[PDB]
Every structure is written in structure tokens, then in C-alpha cells.
Amino acid sequence: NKDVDMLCDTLYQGGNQLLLSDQELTEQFHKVESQLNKLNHLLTDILADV
Amino acid sequence: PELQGIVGDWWEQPGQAALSEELCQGLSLPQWRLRWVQAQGALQKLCS
């Protein structure tokens, strides 16, 4: 029962939804993607101006 | 923003803002450009 308990606690990590991916690594991927999208928007604006 | 400045530089200032009337005393480059605008406007009016 203890084995089941900390296995569930380790896999859930405080979220009701399962967390297969590393959560802070996942939001790191998300912020990298968002900042890359902002840089791409600036770059495409510069491409349109050029 | 550095690339935006580089984009602006070529578009409107290719060494144009680096001149005066004392350097090259005869006539300065804005005066040459104004004379060109007047003459080319006269030519465009005559052509049309």
C-alpha cells in the first residue's frame, strides 16, 4: 500500500491530470516556443519591409 | 532593432546626411537634389 501510495504521488506530482513530461521542462519548452514565435513575428515583419 | 536600423539606413540615408555646404563648396548635395527635383518635375510636366 505504501509502494502504491508514493508511486501515485511521484507520478501525479500534485496534479489531478497525469504528468508524464517534466512539468517545469514542459513550460520551458512552451516559453521557448512563445519567445521563438515572437522573434519569428519580428523577423517576418522585417522580411515584409525588406 | 539593430537590423531595423540597418533597414532604415539603406532606405533613406546612404551617406546623404554626411555632407555640408563647406565641404564641396560649389553646391551642396541637397541643392543638387532640389535642382534635380525641379528639372525632373518640369520634364514630367512637359511629357504629360
Swiss-Prot record, chain A:
Species: Homo sapiens
Q: What are the subcellular locations of this protein? A: Cytoplasm, Cytoskeleton, Microtubule organizing center, Centrosome; Cytoplasm, Cytoskeleton, Spindle
What's the superkingdom here? Eukaryota
Q: How does it assemble?
A: Component of the HAUS augmin-like complex. The complex interacts with the gamma-tubulin ring complex and this interaction is required for spindle assembly. Interacts with EML3 (phosphorylated at 'Thr-881').
According to its UniProt record, which protein family does this protein belong to?
Answer: Belongs to the HAUS3 family.
Job of this protein:
Contributes to mitotic spindle assembly, maintenance of centrosome integrity and completion of cytokinesis as part of the HAUS augmin-like complex.
**What protein am I looking at?**
HAUS augmin-like complex subunit 3
Portion held of the full protein:
504 to 553 of 603
From Swiss-Prot, chain B:
Subcellular location as annotated: Cytoplasm, Cytoskeleton, Microtubule organizing center, Centrosome; Cytoplasm, Cytoskeleton, Spindle
- Task performed by this protein: Contributes to mitotic spindle assembly, maintenance of centrosome integrity and completion of cytokinesis as part of the HAUS augmin-like complex.
Q: How does it assemble?
A: Component of the HAUS augmin-like complex. The complex interacts with the gamma-tubulin ring complex and this interaction is required for spindle assembly. Interacts with EML3 (phosphorylated at 'Thr-881').
* Record family assignment: Belongs to the HAUS5 family.
The protein's name: HAUS augmin-like complex subunit 5
